[PDB]
Design a protein around this nucleic acid. Structure first.
Lengths: 282, 94, 125, 410, 50, 122
RNA sequence: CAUUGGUGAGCAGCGAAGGAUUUGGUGGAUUACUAGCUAAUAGCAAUCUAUUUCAAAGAAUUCAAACUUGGGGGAAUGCCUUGUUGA
RNA sequence: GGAGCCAGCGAGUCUAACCUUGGCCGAGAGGUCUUGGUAAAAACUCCGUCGGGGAACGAGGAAUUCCUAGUAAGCGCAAGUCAUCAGCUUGCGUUGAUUACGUCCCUGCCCUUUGUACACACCG
RNA sequence: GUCGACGUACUUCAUAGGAUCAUUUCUAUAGGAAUCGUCACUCUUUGACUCUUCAAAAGAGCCACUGAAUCCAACUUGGUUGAUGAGU
């Protein structure tokens, strides 16, 4: 089993290497597509070539969800396990419970006397899609790690401006309807990665008249999450906020599972660079 | 075929498949094989298959699917209203 | 050759290596005889396999046990599992299969943790 | 696929979700839940029967899941997998929970008892273990390696004393009373066992056939010469025909297609076994078709509590002197089918209620067996009906207590 | 080195496993000598040297 | 190829064949249908064979020695062993090829690692 | 101190005109045992040849015949088919 | 108070305080000695001994929060990884429990009220 | 905010002459060297063969009869007036 996942990761890495060295080839085939589409001069290298002009029949016959999620995007509704750091604190326990309530298809795991590799392998043995692990400081929640399990990716965000729902008000209970999502101002390929990981973190295939909205807006590289219930009036549709609110911020992104600590870093927040204050998303 | 019997027929199979198959009534004795006995004796068709109650032919009468036929002449108007609402929810799904 | 056999025993995070070879009828655990294991209430739990089976079968052999890691109760369960599987292996290798089977039946009917350990992996729902 | 033996039609076809190939199948006693397991994705799929969707994907066996079955009398699922593991799933009762049990070697055969309380699992290391299922302890095991006769292939290079291609068990099944096990492997032999005394009854060699490979285990120094064992010499050229000359064999074809595609000899291996619910016969499906072995108490004589006086002569004498209970009890004690048939055909109806009521409990199974056989090949339908009516009305609740004791004759 | 340690592949057979031997700690022992013949002098050679 | 390009028959059939070959093991990269035409070699099939898989997984030492081992009967595919040396193996059984227990080979291996555990008589 | 490393000196015990190891050749086995040869209802078996020759029996696809070819391209001249020219 | 004995992550020519007392050396710069005061495996087992606090305080009400096995709790050792954390944060090992594993009756939540899916059965 | 016109910067291409080899003679040139019924020796390369190292794994298996080799014990013979060992 574990061997099967091992050689799986091997074959995925090899296909990535071939994809890199075939990007340029895809470009040359697209150019030849355009040339046959409209007769034009053909440029120097592809003009002089013999193998390309020979094998371009199958190639003409040739011809988007990210690859780590690709087979099971919208078929099997994902299952998530949310667990606490180590010898938990009580404020953190309440807030992790709130996160479990916030998502659907979620179950909670107290952690005392565990180790990271044993936990992650046990979760893979059980068969679980997605994992959330929480870290705090003095009651205040501050750090969150998301993983996708079949050697998928992990993201690590910090999270600051948290307020628990009960400490907003002693209100009542949520509805837990399969919610909705709005994604604002996302630009980069990194932005597409994070909207992809969060979309596959939610439930898949909601209704047409579901009455809970969950937002995601980029406000100066600080992903602000809110949650409101809405009921459609005739002229101004009223939104009642419920569920916790907190300011979330990316800082690192691994291409392995969270237990690895030495996978391929596909992004990492640069701090002490000359233009750190300058750029956005960098 | 030659590839699989080469390669020890363990493969990953054909993805998805649909095609309508007709069936005709000739009883199960002729359906089964050539041998001096028999095993099942009813028709190869079900009663629901050879006849379910069809939706009503003439226009002023209503056939439900459980065999209670009504007309628009022997109905009280409230039950007329109920029947219209039931057809409404049926055509609302369909 | 010297007719010999080797086995392992394992509680949660400890290791119990057991050599078993033909000899004069002794026990040795960490270079000290087995009247001197420490916890002194679980000494009987260490004694358990011998007192389950009998004593002559341990009168005609030689054990050498070395344990590392773990804590008290973990080491103790480790030693008892190691002695069990080692005795069964020696019987399987050099004397009759029927004796091996009656040994195995008496053990597993008593308590299966002697012959197979349970490394406790969790169940997530 | 479902199949209905009344209108001969696969009314429902259940599928996988990424289309993996299948190896084992198991069905709830109530025709409600059908579960299946593979060896390529090691997740037990399970469909509802009432609608052709797939209900759920049971998970938790690292590596392939080979055998499945059901405890019907409390309806639990048992899975047996190359994980070295046995899992027991409770899938109803709104808990849906697990219990695992480890076995020393990779298990590959599984069966349940009709009591639903004991599960017999068979390893690869030749052991056949038997568990209580309510608590997880190991009740009874039998080492079963040594009495398995493996052949030595002409294409081999070792001996049958060293080989390990067949020193295990493919398939297990329980007998319906709960006492005996049939076990069959890729060997040459079917073994038959008793569970409580944990000692086998017999070894059965399936086919003493030179043409198949794995029958003999000692080959002939006459045959093997200084170039090859003479049975790897292709004689396709010797044939006086083209259809016999050519082949189609592909290199290393195993488990596929016809036999012409194999430049090798067809191996012999008992593939599946089951007892009979309707008699003590048992059937073994092997590479040469189906074998069926039965019993004959007309040809044996295993009497029960004899004495110097009980005798065919005295039994016929008491029959003509009209003490029918004594005549019947004597003939049952002698257990000769012809005497039993004699007293059963000669006694009259106006003693049937009393006699049937005062037959005793130890002989009840024998008389039920005999009425079954005689009736299904006889001609006195009304007579045998009167007997079965009287016997059932006499000792109905007693059968209901010892249901498992008469579960093979009823 | 750590990634090799991940993909150990625990089934291999290198024939040096008949000649190498290993501590219980796991570490691979090696000789101060190097050769295959001077592991231990025998009694004839010790008679000569003495 | 001789079919016209934009037929869904053509597309779906070629893609299905590419699934079949990529699961079979002969061709490596699933995307270039040119490499369907041009990479398919008897060398590729014969390297999907059994003994090359041993030299792949570093079971045996070199390929001839692997052929000696499979002929001598020490190596099993899943639950049964193999004697026909010319076994083809796909990826999903490359996952399960291993040495047979209580072989002197596995004995030597775990002895060098000092981990023979003769309760299993490995 | 332990050595489950190497060698080598001696006992305790086992013990009938010796003991231990290795290796070649050969015989019988390794499927259920009706005798040898030939021109074969007989004869031979020390040999069939100076009876072993005659007669009878018997000639369709008017010559049907690569079921067998590694894959894409074509083949001057050969080869096969198709028509045609002249005897 | 003795005495017995048990773990696991970790290794960048890299890992670390303060002021004070004076002698001597030198043009110094400062150097060296001298001197006083302040910040920084354990539980386990066994044996031997003993039997209110320097004015608040003797296990912490009303309410309220969480949790169903390597979990609650207890005990320590290590690090300090481009965001957070030194008033701490995160790793690892040790020891390892009581009580539920059923239920929709209350509290809330959802889904379905059209057999639609192909036998037999069930309802209609 | 995209695109047209300009302006401007950048990337990109020719090759010629002479020789030789290629048609089972002959690449087109007469400027160029090659025809034979073998007798012996040395050297060198390449392998078959028997053994074998690095370093194994497995045995067409049983029994009997007749041979051999090795090592012990036992015996004989030589030996402190010197056997074994050891680079003028």
């Amino acid at each position: 089993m574990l061997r099967r996942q091992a050689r799986e990761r091997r074959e995925y890495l090899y296909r990535k290497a071939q994809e890199l060295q075939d990007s340029q080839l895809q470009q040359k085939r697209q150019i030849i597509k355009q040339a046959l589409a409209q007769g034009k001069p053909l440029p120097k290298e592809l003009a002089e070539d013999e193998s390309l002009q020979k094998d371009f029949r199958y190639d003409q016959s040739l011809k988007q969800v990210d690859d780590e999620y690709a087979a099971t995007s919208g078929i099997m509704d994902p299952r998530i396990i949310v667990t606490t750091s180590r010898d938990p604190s009580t404020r953190l326990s309440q807030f992790a419970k709130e996160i479990k309530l916030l998502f659907p298809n979620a179950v909670r795991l107290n952690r005392g006397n565990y180790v990271m590799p044993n936990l992650v392998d046990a979760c893979k043995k059980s068969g679980t899609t997605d994992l959330v692990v929480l870290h705090e400081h003095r009651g205040v929640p501050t750090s969150l790690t998301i993983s996708h399990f079949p050697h998928g990716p992990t993201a690590q965000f910090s999270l600051h401006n948290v307020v628990m729902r009960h400490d907003i008000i002693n209100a009542g209970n949520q509805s837990e309807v399969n919610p909705h999502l709005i994604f604002d101002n996302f630009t980069t390929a990194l932005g597409k990665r994070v909207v992809c990981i969060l979309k596959h973190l939610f439930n898949a295939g909601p209704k047409k008249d579901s009455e809970r909205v969950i937002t995601f807006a980029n406000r100066g590289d600080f992903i602000s999450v809110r949650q409101h219930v809405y009921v459609r009036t005739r002229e101004g549709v009223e939104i009642a906020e419920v569920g916790p609110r907190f300011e979330m911020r990316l800082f690192e992104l691994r291409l392995g599972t969270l237990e690895n600590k030495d996978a391929d870093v596909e992004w990492q927040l640069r701090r002490f660079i000359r233009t750190a204050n300058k750029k956005d998303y960098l | 075929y030659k590839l699989d019997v080469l390669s020890s027929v363990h493969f990953v199979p054909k993805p998805a498949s649909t095609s309508l198959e007709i069936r005709v009534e000739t009883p199960t004795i002729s359906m089964e094989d050539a041998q001096p006995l028999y095993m099942s004796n009813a028709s190869s068709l079900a009663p629901q298959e050879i006849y379910n109650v069809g939706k009503a032919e003439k226009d002023g009468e209503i056939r439900l699917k459980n065999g209670v036929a009504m007309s628009k002449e022997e109905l009280t108007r409230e039950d007329k209203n109920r029947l219209r609402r039931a057809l409404k929810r049926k055509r609302s799904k369909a | 050759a010297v007719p010999s056999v080797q086995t392992f025993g394992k509680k949660k995070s400890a290791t119990a290596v057991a050599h078993v070879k033909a000899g004069k009828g002794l026990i040795k655990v960490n270079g000290s005889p087995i009247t001197l294991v420490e916890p002194e209430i679980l000494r009987f739990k260490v004694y358990e396999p011998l007192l389950l089976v009998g004593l002559d079968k341990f009168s005609n052999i030689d054990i050498r046990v070395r344990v590392t890691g773990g804590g008290h109760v973990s080491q103790v369960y480790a030693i008892r599992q190691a002695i069990a599987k080692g005795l069964v292996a020696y019987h399987q290798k050099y004397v009759d299969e029927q004796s091996k089977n009656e040994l195995k039946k008496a053990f597993t009917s008593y308590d299966r943790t002697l012959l197979i350990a349970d490394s406790r992996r969790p169940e997530p729902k | 696929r479902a199949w209905d033996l009344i209108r001969y039609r696969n009314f429902r076809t259940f599928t996988g979700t990424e289309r993996i190939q299948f190896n084992c199948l198991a069905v709830d006693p109530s025709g409600e839940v059908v579960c299946a397991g593979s060896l390529d994705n090691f997740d037990i799929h399970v469909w509802s029967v009432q609608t052709g969707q797939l209900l759920d994907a049971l998970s938790g066996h690292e590596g392939p899941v080979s055998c499945l079955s059901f405890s019907q009398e409390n309806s639990v699922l048992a899975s047996a997998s190359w994980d070295k593991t046995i899992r027991i799933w409770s899938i109803f009762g709104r808990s849906q929970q697990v219990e695992p049990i480890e076995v020393y070697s990779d298990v590959l055969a599984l069966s349940m008892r009709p009591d639903g309380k004991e599960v017999a699992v068979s390893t690869l290391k030749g052991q056949i273990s038997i568990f209580n299922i309510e608590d997880a302890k190991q009740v009874g095991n039998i080492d079963c390696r040594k009495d398995i006769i493996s052949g030595r292939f002409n294409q081999d290079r070792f001996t049958a004393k060293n080989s390990e291609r067949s020193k295990f068990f493919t398939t297990i099944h329980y007998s319906f009373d709960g006492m005996a096990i049939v076990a069959g492997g890729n060997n040459n032999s079917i073994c038959l066992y008793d569970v409580p005394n944990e000692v086998l009854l017999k070894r059965f060699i399936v086919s003493r056939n030179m043409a198949l490979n794995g029958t003999l285990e000692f080959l002939n120094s006459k045959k093997m010469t200084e170039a090859g064992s003479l049975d790897l010499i292709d004689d396709a050229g010797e044939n006086s025909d083209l259809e016999d000359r050519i082949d189609n064999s592909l290199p290393g074809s195993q488990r596929g297609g016809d036999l012409s595609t194999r430049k090798m000899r067809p191996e012999v291996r008992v593939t599946s076994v089951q007892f009979s619910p309707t008699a003590n016969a048992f059937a073994a499906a092997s590479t040469e078709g189906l074998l069926i072995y039965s019993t004959n108490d007309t040809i044996l004589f295993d009497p029960f509590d004899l004495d110097v006086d009980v005798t065919p002569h005295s039994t016929v004498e008491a029959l003509r002197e009209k003490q029918f209970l004594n005549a019947l009890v004597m003939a049952f004690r002698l257990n000769e089918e012809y005497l039993i048939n004699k007293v059963y055909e000669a006694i009259p109806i106006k003693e049937i209620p009393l006699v049937a009521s005062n037959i005793p409990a130890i002989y009840l199974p024998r008389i039920l067996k005999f009425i079954g056989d005689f009736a299904i090949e006889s001609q006195h339908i009304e007579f045998n009906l009167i007997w079965i009516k009287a016997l059932l009305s006499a000792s109905g609740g007693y059968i209901n207590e010892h249901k498992y004791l008469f579960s093979t004759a009823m | 080195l750590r990634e090799k340690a991940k993909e150990r592949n625990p089934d291999e057979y290198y024939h040096a496993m008949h000649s190498r031997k290993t501590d219980a700690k796991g570490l691979l022992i090696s000789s101060r000598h190097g050769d295959e013949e001077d592991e231990s002098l025998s009694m004839d050679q010790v008679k000569l040297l003495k | 190829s001789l079919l016209p390009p934009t037929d869904p028959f053509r597309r779906k059939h070629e893609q299905l064949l590419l699934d079949k070959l990529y699961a079979m093991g002969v061709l490596t990269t699933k995307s270039k249908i040119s490499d369907l035409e041009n990479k398919v070699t008897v060398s590729a099939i014969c390297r999907r064979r059994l003994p090359v898989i041993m030299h792949r997984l570093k079971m045996a030492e070199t390929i001839q020695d692997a052929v000696k081992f499979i002929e001598q009967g020490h190596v099993r595919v899943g639950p049964n062993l193999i004697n026909d040396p010319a076994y083809l193996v796909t990826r999903n059984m490359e996952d399960y090829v291993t040495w047979v227990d209580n072989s002197k080979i596995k004995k030597t291996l775990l002895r060098y690692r000092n981990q023979i555990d003769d309760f299993d008589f490995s």
